[PDB]
């Protein structure tokens, strides 16, 4: 029974879908416009209309609306009609998966390590709340600004990403904070490869036997062995042997302090974090919310 004041019930008359942004396995993402009651103003919003109980949907949506963390997208409004529409703050930059693909071999080491830090802080918040995401992947990490990423779609899996799933989840539908750690390792791998698809050319049916044999995702060319060992540690068979989100925040923050020693990127001395001037601009314009300082190179 969380705070019902975090979820605003929207009527079909207060909003309108205008543009198409993309679509995934759960639904289609639209750029929306909210017209608040008794007002003339049009306010951009992001709307996800689902693909396929009202009391039960709302119960889950209140939990989804209670996630208050700088690296977790909070559900803001819901519109229950014949379809289920979810409303959240519009993010022009979209997902990190497409951002890294559209910026292939053009992303600095400071960005990658800081994103790994931020994703770990978002998941660590979810673990403190005893919440399991179940669908962590670079497609479910949104870019607020290039220096601020946030985990999206928490609770959508509750209402199959085999290549992002831990073996116990594939075999026994078991989902814990430690299976989320496995998915996180796969997500870090997607970033380090600038958007590569994991186990490309391998049918989803073969993955469980491939894992049981001891096969894992290859070392991305930019990762030193210390970075690869952390990703490997995330894919251990024994869930309790895998690192904690708590430990991943510290390890990746320590690595962000010496970026060149942990990632080998060509043209990296040029690709630095933005000047205070450009970060002040981005913040006042599109990121007023309070977040921890991005880890700088000593
Ligand atoms: C690579 C894919 C991509 O570019 N995007 C995926 C995506 N989803 C959403 C989104 C998510 C949600 C949402 C958030 C919390 C809980 C439940 C839930 F459905 C939503 F309501 C609406 N959109 N976006 C998105 C796009 C633009 N601004 C914000 N979110 C993307 C982008």
Short mmCIF file of C-alpha atoms and ligand atoms in Angstrom, two decimals:
data_model
loop_
_atom_site.label_atom_id
_atom_site.label_comp_id
_atom_site.label_asym_id
_atom_site.label_seq_id
_atom_site.Cartn_x
_atom_site.Cartn_y
_atom_site.Cartn_z
CA UNK A 1 0.00 0.00 0.00
CA UNK A 2 2.30 2.84 -1.18
CA UNK A 3 1.49 6.57 -1.71
CA UNK A 4 -1.50 6.82 -4.12
CA UNK A 5 -0.60 10.53 -4.64
CA UNK A 6 2.40 9.49 -6.79
CA UNK A 7 0.14 8.15 -9.59
CA UNK A 8 -2.06 10.65 -11.40
CA UNK A 9 -5.12 9.11 -13.06
CA UNK A 10 -5.38 10.64 -16.54
CA UNK A 11 -8.59 10.94 -18.59
CA UNK A 12 -8.38 10.43 -22.37
CA UNK A 13 -9.40 14.10 -22.79
CA UNK A 14 -6.36 15.53 -20.89
CA UNK A 15 -3.75 14.07 -23.32
CA UNK A 16 -3.08 13.18 -26.98
CA UNK A 17 -0.39 10.97 -28.66
CA UNK A 18 1.25 13.05 -31.45
CA UNK A 19 4.45 11.37 -32.76
CA UNK A 20 5.87 7.80 -32.92
CA UNK A 21 9.21 7.34 -31.08
CA UNK A 22 9.61 3.54 -31.30
CA UNK A 23 8.13 0.25 -30.05
CA UNK A 24 9.22 -2.86 -28.18
CA UNK A 25 7.81 -6.15 -26.88
CA UNK A 26 5.42 -4.55 -24.38
CA UNK A 27 4.12 -1.61 -26.40
CA UNK A 28 4.59 1.47 -28.53
CA UNK A 29 6.28 4.67 -27.33
CA UNK A 30 4.67 7.95 -28.41
CA UNK A 31 5.57 11.59 -27.84
CA UNK A 32 2.50 13.01 -26.12
CA UNK A 33 1.00 16.34 -25.11
CA UNK A 34 -0.80 16.88 -21.84
CA UNK A 35 -3.32 19.74 -21.69
CA UNK A 36 -3.97 20.34 -17.96
CA UNK A 37 -7.63 20.92 -16.89
CA UNK A 38 -8.79 24.51 -17.37
CA UNK A 39 -5.50 25.44 -19.14
CA UNK A 40 -4.46 26.29 -22.73
CA UNK A 41 -0.87 24.94 -22.40
CA UNK A 42 0.45 21.79 -24.16
CA UNK A 43 3.08 19.90 -22.14
CA UNK A 44 5.29 17.28 -23.78
CA UNK A 45 5.13 13.83 -22.11
CA UNK A 46 6.22 10.26 -23.05
CA UNK A 47 3.39 7.74 -23.41
CA UNK A 48 3.69 3.95 -23.69
CA UNK A 49 0.48 2.24 -24.88
CA UNK A 50 0.55 -1.49 -23.98
CA UNK A 51 -0.02 -4.48 -26.34
CA UNK A 52 -2.79 -6.55 -24.63
CA UNK A 53 -8.00 -6.70 -13.84
CA UNK A 54 -8.13 -2.84 -13.38
CA UNK A 55 -7.80 -3.10 -9.60
CA UNK A 56 -4.69 -5.31 -9.96
CA UNK A 57 -3.10 -3.11 -12.71
CA UNK A 58 -3.45 -0.02 -10.50
CA UNK A 59 -1.95 -1.89 -7.49
CA UNK A 60 1.22 -2.57 -9.56
CA UNK A 61 1.22 0.95 -11.09
CA UNK A 62 1.34 2.50 -7.53
CA UNK A 63 4.53 0.52 -6.83
CA UNK A 64 5.88 1.67 -10.28
CA UNK A 65 5.03 5.30 -9.40
CA UNK A 66 6.80 5.11 -5.96
CA UNK A 67 10.34 4.55 -7.40
CA UNK A 68 12.09 7.79 -6.45
CA UNK A 69 15.75 7.66 -7.57
CA UNK A 70 17.81 9.82 -10.06
CA UNK A 71 18.64 6.70 -12.06
CA UNK A 72 15.16 5.14 -12.11
CA UNK A 73 12.35 6.36 -14.39
CA UNK A 74 9.29 6.94 -12.23
CA UNK A 75 5.80 6.13 -13.65
CA UNK A 76 3.82 9.46 -13.36
CA UNK A 77 0.35 8.86 -14.78
CA UNK A 78 -1.90 6.06 -16.01
CA UNK A 79 -4.93 5.95 -18.33
CA UNK A 80 -6.98 2.71 -18.06
CA UNK A 81 -9.53 2.40 -20.93
CA UNK A 82 -9.71 -0.60 -23.44
CA UNK A 83 -5.83 -0.17 -23.56
CA UNK A 84 -3.36 0.60 -20.71
CA UNK A 85 -1.42 3.87 -21.22
CA UNK A 86 1.62 4.77 -19.11
CA UNK A 87 2.90 8.36 -18.89
CA UNK A 88 6.39 9.52 -17.79
CA UNK A 89 8.76 12.51 -18.41
CA UNK A 90 9.73 12.78 -22.12
CA UNK A 91 13.39 12.06 -22.84
CA UNK A 92 14.48 13.41 -26.24
CA UNK A 93 17.74 11.33 -26.30
CA UNK A 94 15.89 8.01 -26.09
CA UNK A 95 17.59 4.74 -25.09
CA UNK A 96 21.29 4.13 -24.45
CA UNK A 97 21.36 1.12 -26.83
CA UNK A 98 20.53 3.33 -29.87
CA UNK A 99 22.72 6.17 -28.52
CA UNK A 100 25.83 3.92 -28.35
CA UNK A 101 25.00 2.44 -31.81
CA UNK A 102 24.51 5.95 -33.26
CA UNK A 103 27.80 6.98 -31.54
CA UNK A 104 29.71 3.70 -32.46
CA UNK A 105 33.45 4.01 -31.62
CA UNK A 106 32.88 7.68 -30.64
CA UNK A 107 32.22 7.42 -26.88
CA UNK A 108 34.83 8.23 -24.28
CA UNK A 109 35.91 5.95 -21.45
CA UNK A 110 34.60 8.45 -18.85
CA UNK A 111 31.04 8.09 -20.22
CA UNK A 112 31.00 4.25 -20.33
CA UNK A 113 32.34 3.85 -16.76
CA UNK A 114 30.01 6.56 -15.39
CA UNK A 115 26.98 4.95 -17.08
CA UNK A 116 27.99 1.58 -15.52
CA UNK A 117 28.17 3.42 -12.12
CA UNK A 118 24.71 5.06 -12.57
CA UNK A 119 23.03 1.84 -13.75
CA UNK A 120 24.44 0.10 -10.62
CA UNK A 121 23.08 2.92 -8.38
CA UNK A 122 19.60 2.57 -9.97
CA UNK A 123 19.52 -1.20 -9.48
CA UNK A 124 20.99 -0.89 -5.96
CA UNK A 125 18.03 1.41 -5.13
CA UNK A 126 15.63 -1.25 -6.48
CA UNK A 127 17.37 -3.95 -4.36
CA UNK A 128 17.08 -1.74 -1.19
CA UNK A 129 13.30 -1.56 -1.93
CA UNK A 130 13.26 -5.41 -2.49
CA UNK A 131 12.20 -4.87 -6.11
CA UNK A 132 13.35 -7.08 -8.98
CA UNK A 133 13.48 -5.44 -12.41
CA UNK A 134 13.54 -8.71 -14.44
CA UNK A 135 14.29 -6.91 -17.72
CA UNK A 136 17.59 -4.96 -17.42
CA UNK A 137 19.10 -4.42 -20.91
CA UNK A 138 20.63 -1.37 -22.71
CA UNK A 139 17.24 -0.91 -24.51
CA UNK A 140 15.75 -0.25 -20.97
CA UNK A 141 18.29 2.40 -19.98
CA UNK A 142 17.28 5.92 -21.06
CA UNK A 143 19.56 8.90 -21.64
CA UNK A 144 18.33 12.09 -19.74
CA UNK A 145 21.48 14.00 -20.96
CA UNK A 146 24.73 12.25 -22.18
CA UNK A 147 25.95 12.49 -18.53
CA UNK A 148 22.74 11.15 -16.91
CA UNK A 149 21.18 7.78 -17.56
CA UNK A 150 18.14 6.20 -15.86
CA UNK A 151 16.67 2.66 -15.80
CA UNK A 152 13.21 2.45 -17.41
CA UNK A 153 10.21 0.00 -17.60
CA UNK A 154 10.41 -1.18 -13.96
CA UNK A 155 7.32 -3.36 -13.32
CA UNK A 156 6.44 -3.84 -16.99
CA UNK A 157 7.74 -7.46 -16.95
CA UNK A 158 5.29 -8.21 -14.05
CA UNK A 159 2.57 -6.28 -16.12
CA UNK A 160 11.27 -13.26 -22.86
CA UNK A 161 14.83 -11.79 -23.01
CA UNK A 162 16.60 -15.25 -22.98
CA UNK A 163 20.00 -13.70 -24.00
CA UNK A 164 19.91 -11.28 -21.02
CA UNK A 165 18.56 -13.91 -18.50
CA UNK A 166 20.51 -15.73 -15.84
CA UNK A 167 20.56 -19.56 -16.30
CA UNK A 168 18.29 -20.14 -13.24
CA UNK A 169 15.75 -17.70 -14.74
CA UNK A 170 15.79 -19.55 -18.11
CA UNK A 171 15.46 -22.98 -16.46
CA UNK A 172 13.24 -22.31 -13.48
CA UNK A 173 11.69 -18.81 -14.00
CA UNK A 174 13.57 -17.71 -10.82
CA UNK A 175 14.11 -13.93 -10.62
CA UNK A 176 16.10 -12.37 -7.82
CA UNK A 177 18.39 -9.32 -7.31
CA UNK A 178 21.26 -11.73 -8.23
CA UNK A 179 19.59 -12.68 -11.60
CA UNK A 180 19.32 -8.88 -12.23
CA UNK A 181 23.13 -8.75 -11.70
CA UNK A 182 23.55 -11.25 -14.60
CA UNK A 183 21.39 -9.00 -16.86
CA UNK A 184 23.51 -6.02 -15.74
CA UNK A 185 26.68 -7.83 -16.90
CA UNK A 186 25.03 -8.42 -20.29
CA UNK A 187 24.00 -4.66 -20.35
CA UNK A 188 27.67 -3.53 -19.61
CA UNK A 189 28.75 -5.89 -22.45
CA UNK A 190 26.29 -4.15 -24.87
CA UNK A 191 27.81 -0.76 -23.95
CA UNK A 192 31.46 -1.85 -24.28
CA UNK A 193 30.68 -3.31 -27.73
CA UNK A 194 28.87 -0.07 -28.76
CA UNK A 195 25.55 -1.88 -29.19
CA UNK A 196 26.45 -5.44 -30.35
CA UNK A 197 23.72 -8.11 -30.03
CA UNK A 198 24.72 -10.83 -27.48
CA UNK A 199 25.14 -14.41 -28.88
CA UNK A 200 24.50 -13.21 -32.45
CA UNK A 201 23.55 -16.05 -34.79
CA UNK A 202 22.71 -18.40 -31.91
CA UNK A 203 19.09 -19.52 -31.54
CA UNK A 204 17.48 -18.61 -28.19
CA UNK A 205 16.88 -22.36 -27.59
CA UNK A 206 20.62 -23.13 -27.52
CA UNK A 207 21.55 -20.47 -24.91
CA UNK A 208 20.87 -22.63 -21.78
CA UNK A 209 23.05 -25.52 -22.99
CA UNK A 210 25.71 -23.02 -24.22
CA UNK A 211 25.77 -21.56 -20.66
CA UNK A 212 25.92 -24.98 -19.00
CA UNK A 213 29.01 -25.76 -21.20
CA UNK A 214 30.70 -22.62 -19.75
CA UNK A 215 30.51 -20.42 -22.85
CA UNK A 216 30.11 -16.66 -22.07
CA UNK A 217 30.07 -13.37 -24.06
CA UNK A 218 33.47 -12.51 -25.62
CA UNK A 219 35.81 -9.89 -24.18
CA UNK A 220 34.91 -6.59 -25.95
CA UNK A 221 38.03 -5.17 -27.69
CA UNK A 222 38.14 -2.02 -25.48
CA UNK A 223 37.96 -3.82 -22.13
CA UNK A 224 41.02 -4.64 -20.14
CA UNK A 225 41.08 -8.02 -18.32
CA UNK A 226 40.00 -6.33 -15.01
CA UNK A 227 36.83 -4.99 -16.76
CA UNK A 228 36.19 -8.37 -18.39
CA UNK A 229 36.63 -10.21 -15.05
CA UNK A 230 33.85 -8.11 -13.51
CA UNK A 231 31.50 -8.96 -16.44
CA UNK A 232 32.53 -12.64 -16.13
CA UNK A 233 31.83 -12.54 -12.36
CA UNK A 234 28.24 -11.42 -13.18
CA UNK A 235 27.66 -14.63 -15.16
CA UNK A 236 28.74 -17.18 -12.47
CA UNK A 237 26.35 -20.20 -12.11
CA UNK A 238 26.14 -19.74 -8.32
CA UNK A 239 24.04 -16.58 -7.86
CA UNK A 240 25.55 -15.71 -4.44
CA UNK A 241 29.08 -15.71 -6.04
CA UNK A 242 28.06 -12.88 -8.43
CA UNK A 243 28.86 -9.31 -7.28
CA UNK A 244 26.34 -7.14 -5.44
CA UNK A 245 25.10 -3.86 -7.07
CA UNK A 246 26.70 -2.24 -3.94
CA UNK A 247 30.12 -3.66 -4.99
CA UNK A 248 29.64 -2.84 -8.70
CA UNK A 249 29.07 0.92 -7.80
CA UNK A 250 32.40 1.01 -5.93
CA UNK A 251 34.42 -0.99 -8.50
CA UNK A 252 33.14 0.96 -11.46
CA UNK A 253 33.60 4.34 -9.58
CA UNK A 254 37.21 3.39 -8.73
CA UNK A 255 37.70 2.61 -12.47
CA UNK A 256 36.16 5.96 -13.54
CA UNK A 257 38.93 7.77 -11.51
CA UNK A 258 41.56 6.25 -13.89
CA UNK A 259 39.66 5.73 -17.18
CA UNK A 260 42.64 4.95 -19.54
CA UNK A 261 43.90 2.16 -17.25
CA UNK A 262 40.59 0.22 -17.60
CA UNK A 263 39.40 0.90 -21.16
CA UNK A 264 41.44 1.16 -24.38
CA UNK A 265 39.63 3.58 -26.73
CA UNK A 266 41.21 5.15 -29.86
CA UNK A 267 40.89 8.93 -29.77
CA UNK A 268 39.97 8.97 -26.03
CA UNK A 269 42.18 11.93 -25.00
CA UNK A 270 39.85 14.10 -27.20
CA UNK A 271 36.55 12.61 -25.86
CA UNK A 272 36.41 14.12 -22.35
CA UNK A 273 33.39 14.87 -20.05
CA UNK A 274 31.72 18.21 -20.99
CA UNK A 275 33.12 21.50 -19.64
CA UNK A 276 31.34 23.01 -16.55
CA UNK A 277 29.89 25.55 -19.08
CA UNK A 278 28.15 22.86 -21.21
CA UNK A 279 26.97 20.80 -18.18
CA UNK A 280 25.48 23.95 -16.59
CA UNK A 281 23.59 24.52 -19.91
CA UNK A 282 22.27 20.91 -20.16
CA UNK A 283 21.23 20.94 -16.43
CA UNK A 284 19.19 24.23 -16.49
CA UNK A 285 17.58 23.33 -19.81
CA UNK A 286 16.67 19.60 -19.47
CA UNK A 287 17.96 18.17 -16.13
CA UNK A 288 17.00 20.27 -13.11
CA UNK A 289 16.66 17.17 -10.82
CA UNK A 290 19.26 16.45 -8.16
CA UNK A 291 21.76 13.62 -8.91
CA UNK A 292 25.16 12.56 -7.44
CA UNK A 293 28.30 14.08 -8.97
CA UNK A 294 29.60 12.31 -12.05
CA UNK A 295 33.00 10.64 -11.21
CA UNK A 296 35.88 12.69 -12.67
CA UNK A 297 39.35 11.48 -13.79
CA UNK A 298 42.03 12.44 -11.19
C1 LIG B 1 15.73 1.78 -27.51
C2 LIG B 1 14.30 1.99 -27.13
C3 LIG B 1 13.99 3.44 -26.82
O1 LIG B 1 14.53 4.35 -27.44
N1 LIG B 1 13.12 3.69 -25.83
C4 LIG B 1 12.42 2.68 -25.04
C5 LIG B 1 11.48 3.48 -24.19
N2 LIG B 1 10.49 3.29 -23.25
C6 LIG B 1 10.08 4.49 -22.90
C7 LIG B 1 8.94 4.72 -21.99
C8 LIG B 1 8.87 3.99 -20.81
C9 LIG B 1 7.75 4.14 -19.99
C10 LIG B 1 7.71 3.49 -18.65
C11 LIG B 1 8.51 3.99 -17.62
C12 LIG B 1 8.37 3.52 -16.32
C13 LIG B 1 7.46 2.53 -16.04
C14 LIG B 1 6.67 1.99 -17.04
C15 LIG B 1 6.81 2.49 -18.31
F1 LIG B 1 5.97 2.04 -19.27
C16 LIG B 1 6.77 5.00 -20.47
F2 LIG B 1 5.65 5.19 -19.73
C17 LIG B 1 6.91 5.69 -21.63
N3 LIG B 1 8.00 5.58 -22.40
N4 LIG B 1 10.80 5.47 -23.57
C18 LIG B 1 10.75 6.90 -23.46
C19 LIG B 1 10.93 7.69 -24.58
C20 LIG B 1 11.01 9.05 -24.34
N5 LIG B 1 10.92 9.59 -23.12
C21 LIG B 1 10.73 8.72 -22.14
N6 LIG B 1 10.62 7.39 -22.23
C22 LIG B 1 11.69 4.81 -24.41
C23 LIG B 1 12.74 5.03 -25.45
#
